[PDB]
Write an enzyme that holds these catalytic residues in place. Sequence first.
Site, PDB file in Angstrom:
ATOM      1  N   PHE A   1       0.485   2.124  -4.208  1.00  0.00           N
ATOM      2  CA  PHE A   1      -0.969   1.232  -4.451  1.00  0.00           C
ATOM      3  C   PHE A   1      -2.262   2.460  -3.692  1.00  0.00           C
ATOM      4  O   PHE A   1      -2.060   2.863  -2.438  1.00  0.00           O
ATOM      5  CB  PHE A   1      -1.918  -0.329  -4.638  1.00  0.00           C
ATOM      6  CG  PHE A   1      -1.114  -0.928  -4.886  1.00  0.00           C
ATOM      7  CD1 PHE A   1       0.636  -0.856  -4.989  1.00  0.00           C
ATOM      8  CD2 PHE A   1      -1.320  -1.071  -5.909  1.00  0.00           C
ATOM      9  CE1 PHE A   1       1.643  -1.574  -5.704  1.00  0.00           C
ATOM     10  CE2 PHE A   1      -0.206  -2.446  -7.170  1.00  0.00           C
ATOM     11  CZ  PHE A   1       0.499  -2.918  -6.630  1.00  0.00           C
ATOM     12  N   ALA A   2      -3.906   2.753  -4.685  1.00  0.00           N
ATOM     13  CA  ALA A   2      -3.947   3.899  -3.919  1.00  0.00           C
ATOM     14  C   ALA A   2      -5.517   3.819  -4.715  1.00  0.00           C
ATOM     15  O   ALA A   2      -6.002   4.066  -5.781  1.00  0.00           O
ATOM     16  CB  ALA A   2      -3.833   4.796  -4.544  1.00  0.00           C
TER      17      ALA A   2
ATOM     18  N   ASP B   1       2.743   1.746   1.670  1.00  0.00           N
ATOM     19  CA  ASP B   1       1.607   1.375   2.226  1.00  0.00           C
ATOM     20  C   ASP B   1       1.366   3.353   1.350  1.00  0.00           C
ATOM     21  O   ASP B   1       2.194   3.918   0.941  1.00  0.00           O
ATOM     22  CB  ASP B   1       0.948   1.451   2.916  1.00  0.00           C
ATOM     23  CG  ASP B   1       0.941  -0.092   3.663  1.00  0.00           C
ATOM     24  OD1 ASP B   1       1.433  -0.551   2.664  1.00  0.00           O
ATOM     25  OD2 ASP B   1       0.344   0.068   4.257  1.00  0.00           O
ATOM     26  N   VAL B   2      -0.187   3.319   1.138  1.00  0.00           N
ATOM     27  CA  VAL B   2      -0.299   4.976   0.527  1.00  0.00           C
ATOM     28  C   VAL B   2      -0.510   5.639   2.409  1.00  0.00           C
ATOM     29  O   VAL B   2      -0.987   6.649   2.246  1.00  0.00           O
ATOM     30  CB  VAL B   2      -1.642   4.509  -0.495  1.00  0.00           C
ATOM     31  CG1 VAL B   2      -3.149   4.032   0.123  1.00  0.00           C
ATOM     32  CG2 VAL B   2      -1.271   6.580  -0.886  1.00  0.00           C
ATOM     33  N   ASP B   3      -1.207   5.419   3.020  1.00  0.00           N
ATOM     34  CA  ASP B   3      -1.970   5.580   3.819  1.00  0.00           C
ATOM     35  C   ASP B   3      -1.202   5.983   5.526  1.00  0.00           C
ATOM     36  O   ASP B   3      -1.174   5.772   6.420  1.00  0.00           O
ATOM     37  CB  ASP B   3      -2.983   4.891   5.042  1.00  0.00           C
ATOM     38  CG  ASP B   3      -2.285   2.983   5.667  1.00  0.00           C
ATOM     39  OD1 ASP B   3      -1.181   2.711   4.544  1.00  0.00           O
ATOM     40  OD2 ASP B   3      -3.112   3.349   6.446  1.00  0.00           O
TER      41      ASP B   3
ATOM     42  N   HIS C   1       8.911  -3.757  11.802  1.00  0.00           N
ATOM     43  CA  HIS C   1       7.298  -2.902  12.438  1.00  0.00           C
ATOM     44  C   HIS C   1       7.418  -2.579  13.257  1.00  0.00           C
ATOM     45  O   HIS C   1       8.309  -3.028  14.418  1.00  0.00           O
ATOM     46  CB  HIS C   1       6.518  -4.221  12.223  1.00  0.00           C
ATOM     47  CG  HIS C   1       5.300  -4.764  12.403  1.00  0.00           C
ATOM     48  ND1 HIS C   1       4.317  -3.492  13.643  1.00  0.00           N
ATOM     49  CD2 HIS C   1       4.253  -4.688  11.323  1.00  0.00           C
ATOM     50  CE1 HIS C   1       3.208  -3.424  12.970  1.00  0.00           C
ATOM     51  NE2 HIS C   1       3.019  -4.191  12.486  1.00  0.00           N
TER      52      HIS C   1
ATOM     53  N   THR D   1       3.454 -11.558  15.212  1.00  0.00           N
ATOM     54  CA  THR D   1       2.790 -12.800  14.515  1.00  0.00           C
ATOM     55  C   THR D   1       3.132 -12.838  13.302  1.00  0.00           C
ATOM     56  O   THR D   1       2.171 -12.889  11.713  1.00  0.00           O
ATOM     57  CB  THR D   1       1.302 -12.012  14.502  1.00  0.00           C
ATOM     58  OG1 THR D   1       1.741 -10.183  14.155  1.00  0.00           O
ATOM     59  CG2 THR D   1       1.221 -10.914  15.611  1.00  0.00           C
TER      60      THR D   1
ATOM     61  N   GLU E   1       1.851  -9.216   4.217  1.00  0.00           N
ATOM     62  CA  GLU E   1       3.431  -9.053   5.303  1.00  0.00           C
ATOM     63  C   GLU E   1       3.983 -10.060   5.924  1.00  0.00           C
ATOM     64  O   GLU E   1       5.016 -10.821   5.856  1.00  0.00           O
ATOM     65  CB  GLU E   1       2.449  -8.568   6.330  1.00  0.00           C
ATOM     66  CG  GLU E   1       3.476  -8.146   7.814  1.00  0.00           C
ATOM     67  CD  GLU E   1       3.147  -6.516   8.221  1.00  0.00           C
ATOM     68  OE1 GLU E   1       2.128  -7.195   8.974  1.00  0.00           O
ATOM     69  OE2 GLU E   1       3.378  -5.642   8.214  1.00  0.00           O
TER      70      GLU E   1
HETATM   71  O1  LIG Z   1     -12.110  -3.836   3.783  1.00  0.00           O
HETATM   72  C1  LIG Z   1     -11.296  -2.890   4.085  1.00  0.00           C
HETATM   73  C2  LIG Z   1      -9.554  -2.493   2.903  1.00  0.00           C
HETATM   74  C3  LIG Z   1      -9.019  -3.136   4.294  1.00  0.00           C
HETATM   75  C4  LIG Z   1      -7.386  -2.669   2.980  1.00  0.00           C
HETATM   76  C5  LIG Z   1      -8.022  -1.686   1.804  1.00  0.00           C
HETATM   77  C6  LIG Z   1      -7.060  -1.117   0.643  1.00  0.00           C
HETATM   78  C7  LIG Z   1      -5.708  -0.866   0.949  1.00  0.00           C
HETATM   79  N1  LIG Z   1      -4.948  -0.489  -0.182  1.00  0.00           N
HETATM   80  C8  LIG Z   1      -3.916  -0.377  -0.134  1.00  0.00           C
HETATM   81  O2  LIG Z   1      -3.002  -1.342   0.516  1.00  0.00           O
HETATM   82  C9  LIG Z   1      -2.033  -0.901   2.022  1.00  0.00           C
HETATM   83  C10 LIG Z   1      -2.274  -1.783   2.988  1.00  0.00           C
HETATM   84  O3  LIG Z   1      -3.808  -1.233   3.249  1.00  0.00           O
HETATM   85  P1  LIG Z   1      -3.950  -0.778   4.984  1.00  0.00           P
HETATM   86  O4  LIG Z   1      -2.984   0.587   4.950  1.00  0.00           O
HETATM   87  O5  LIG Z   1      -5.533  -0.414   5.013  1.00  0.00           O
HETATM   88  O6  LIG Z   1      -3.976  -1.822   5.665  1.00  0.00           O
HETATM   89  P2  LIG Z   1      -2.584  -1.596   6.878  1.00  0.00           P
HETATM   90  O7  LIG Z   1      -1.481  -0.646   7.414  1.00  0.00           O
HETATM   91  O8  LIG Z   1      -3.173  -3.057   8.082  1.00  0.00           O
HETATM   92  O9  LIG Z   1      -1.804  -2.920   5.961  1.00  0.00           O
HETATM   93  C11 LIG Z   1      -0.842  -3.479   6.568  1.00  0.00           C
HETATM   94  O10 LIG Z   1      -0.688  -5.244   6.906  1.00  0.00           O
HETATM   95  C12 LIG Z   1      -1.689  -5.328   5.279  1.00  0.00           C
HETATM   96  C13 LIG Z   1      -1.688  -6.874   5.547  1.00  0.00           C
HETATM   97  O11 LIG Z   1      -1.906  -7.202   4.146  1.00  0.00           O
HETATM   98  C14 LIG Z   1       0.318  -5.254   4.401  1.00  0.00           C
HETATM   99  O12 LIG Z   1       1.119  -6.215   4.222  1.00  0.00           O
HETATM  100  C15 LIG Z   1       0.165  -3.660   3.822  1.00  0.00           C
HETATM  101  O13 LIG Z   1       1.958  -3.316   3.774  1.00  0.00           O
HETATM  102  C16 LIG Z   1       0.814  -3.672   5.993  1.00  0.00           C
HETATM  103  O14 LIG Z   1       0.848  -2.112   6.018  1.00  0.00           O
HETATM  104  C17 LIG Z   1      -3.005   0.684   1.820  1.00  0.00           C
HETATM  105  O15 LIG Z   1      -2.294   1.454   2.475  1.00  0.00           O
HETATM  106  C18 LIG Z   1      -2.856   1.133  -0.130  1.00  0.00           C
HETATM  107  O16 LIG Z   1      -2.034   1.204  -0.634  1.00  0.00           O
HETATM  108  C19 LIG Z   1      -6.210   0.435  -1.207  1.00  0.00           C
HETATM  109  O17 LIG Z   1      -4.995   1.149  -1.712  1.00  0.00           O
HETATM  110  N2  LIG Z   1      -7.109   0.320  -0.542  1.00  0.00           N
HETATM  111  C20 LIG Z   1      -7.795  -0.202  -0.309  1.00  0.00           C
HETATM  112  O18 LIG Z   1      -8.940  -0.419  -0.231  1.00  0.00           O
HETATM  113  S1  LIG Z   1     -10.119  -1.623   2.103  1.00  0.00           S
HETATM  114 MN   LIG Z   2      -1.068   0.927   5.798  1.00  0.00          MN
END
Ligand SMILES: O=Cc1ccc(-c2cn([C@@H]3O[C@H](COP(=O)(O)OP(=O)(O)O[C@H]4O[C@H](CO)[C@H](O)[C@H](O)[C@H]4O)[C@@H](O)[C@H]3O)c(=O)[nH]c2=O)s1
Ligand SMILES: [Mn+2]
Lengths: 274, 274
Positions: free
Chosen positions: B57-58, B139-141, B161, B173, B231
């Site tokens: 997802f992006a 995740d895309v990041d 994790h 957690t 998660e």
């Molecule tokens: O207002 C600020 C934003 C915060 C996310 C955004 C947001 C998120 N994503 C999509 O969502 C993915 C994950 O997002 P993150 O990678 O920012 O957060 P984290 O790394 O802490 O994530 C972990 O914890 C998560 C718990 O829900 C999940 O279980 C997740 O699988 C866990 O790995 C992006 O890579 C993207 O594909 C989008 O595509 N657009 C956005 O704006 S915008």
């Molecule tokens: Mn991520």
Amino acid sequence: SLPRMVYPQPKVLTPCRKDVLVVTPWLAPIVWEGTFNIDILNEQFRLQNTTIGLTVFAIKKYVAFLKLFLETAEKHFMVGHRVHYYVFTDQPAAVPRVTLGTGRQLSVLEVRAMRRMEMISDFCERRFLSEVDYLVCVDVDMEFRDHVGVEILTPLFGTLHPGFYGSSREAFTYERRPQSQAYIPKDEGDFYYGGAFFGGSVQEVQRLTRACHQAMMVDQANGIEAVWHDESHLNKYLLRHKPTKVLSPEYLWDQQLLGWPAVLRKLRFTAVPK
Amino acid sequence: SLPRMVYPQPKVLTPCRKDVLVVTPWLAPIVWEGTFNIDILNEQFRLQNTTIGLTVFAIKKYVAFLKLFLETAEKHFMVGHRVHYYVFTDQPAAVPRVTLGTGRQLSVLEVRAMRRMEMISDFCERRFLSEVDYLVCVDVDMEFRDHVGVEILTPLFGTLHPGFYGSSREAFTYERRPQSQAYIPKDEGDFYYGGAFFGGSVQEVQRLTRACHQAMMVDQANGIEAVWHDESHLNKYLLRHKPTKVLSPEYLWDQQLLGWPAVLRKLRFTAVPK
Ligand SMILES: O=Cc1ccc(-c2cn([C@@H]3O[C@H](COP(=O)(O)OP(=O)(O)O[C@H]4O[C@H](CO)[C@H](O)[C@H](O)[C@H]4O)[C@@H](O)[C@H]3O)c(=O)[nH]c2=O)s1
Ligand SMILES: [Mn+2]
Ligand SMILES: O=Cc1ccc(-c2cn([C@@H]3O[C@H](COP(=O)(O)OP(=O)(O)O[C@H]4O[C@H](CO)[C@H](O)[C@H](O)[C@H]4O)[C@@H](O)[C@H]3O)c(=O)[nH]c2=O)s1
Ligand SMILES: [Mn+2]
């Protein structure tokens, strides 16, 4: 979908066994004591109402082994699960009366006095598909001495032969004549599996026994018989069709010939003096 | 049915890794470098003409991560196998032009700007069942830095994790409020799995994502949101439905936060500074 269970947490940085290989290079577990929590496995298999068939041949003098084989199976084999024993014999009246636990049954299949492969794959094909989920095929000159349970169940398993688990592949007694269907070159082979204990889902065991029977028939027509008969063909099959679990020699042992080495925390299924 | 292959013999009395747990207590392999021979696995999966779907997802600003994610996936993800990328985005025109290897394709699925679970289970259900054999959801990041291949494929997998692989279950957690569907008591839990990398057969991933979506909807109706969102629910699902493989943190790492510990022989899939 498991219920709540309380048990010790696995620890990623604390191996269960450091002395032995616990996974094959194709990511099949190698089943040793210490590697599994039988409470979790029992729950998984009970929730599927798993039925395990156990096939054993007792022809001619070998009917004498059935009493100890079956009595010890009642104490140690798949206890708590549905079990169907299939005893193939030329002497149905020599089958001993053994009292079975609930959920367990025994059928006597009369045969005339290697050909275990044919009997399992062809004659009993439809019956096994309708009656059991997994099949376990063993020698009768054996006894259970400790737990043999659902930790072994998987689509296809073989068991490490107790004579060869520490040997290099060149020393394995595979068939080495290229003229035989069971031929394995000196540079091939993962393990030497024992003919006395193999199994899997009904579908996979029927594929294995059909393939071995066909290969044995080809050899017969070519005037050749593999060095260790069905075990040679089993080894060729499992080389080309990797098992999804491998049982350690805890599951196929001979204490008279090999003792009780430190690497064996349990001796589960063992030869009886013939 | 594999062809002849020449490779090093596994040795029963020589573990591949003595520093880490390589099998779970329910006999699922824990995938670490050194535990698998990728030549054998590649052959097994190629002989089944395996197709792997990768969902990502992006949305909004995160489209900026797609270029590195996809370019590195082309270098490291399932190379040699059939791959179908499914990119879900609110900005189809922001998807970068990335040249793909043979047998690999990319589909852009437009969405409006946790809900990954709903999209995977419901909207795309029929498409995935017809197009791929396994689904991998990430995740895309992130970027691939080393091999991520068919060693991960199995009916259901989760990934450790990287923040918690050395932690006791009390420190995980998990959601701890009994009012949430994601609740896990302090005395339960095997591992803390990361939301950023899970997968399995299409059927099993659809079951997982449907269950998590349903649980999230129940929580929403009760005015509660699990502490770590999807998660938390993934963790509850994998506690009750054990994965058939567990990926080591080689498969989900953050080098900026955690460095490159000796226990990691490879860093395969890693966070990108956001
Ligand atoms: O207002 C600020 C934003 C915060 C996310 C955004 C947001 C998120 N994503 C999509 O969502 C993915 C994950 O997002 P993150 O990678 O920012 O957060 P984290 O790394 O802490 O994530 C972990 O914890 C998560 C718990 O829900 C999940 O279980 C997740 O699988 C866990 O790995 C992006 O890579 C993207 O594909 C989008 O595509 N657009 C956005 O704006 S915008
Ligand atoms: Mn991520
Ligand atoms: O003329 C003397 C006899 C020799 C067997 C007999 C014979 C055999 N069997 C049935 O057959 C089983 C195996 O027999 P063994 O246990 O004597 O030999 P071994 O232990 O060396 O066997 C290994 O090597 C074998 C290779 O073919 C197989 O791969 C086998 O799986 C391997 O384990 C009995 O337990 C019984 O169920 C009978 O039922 N009646 C018999 O008369 S009578
Ligand atoms: Mn025998």
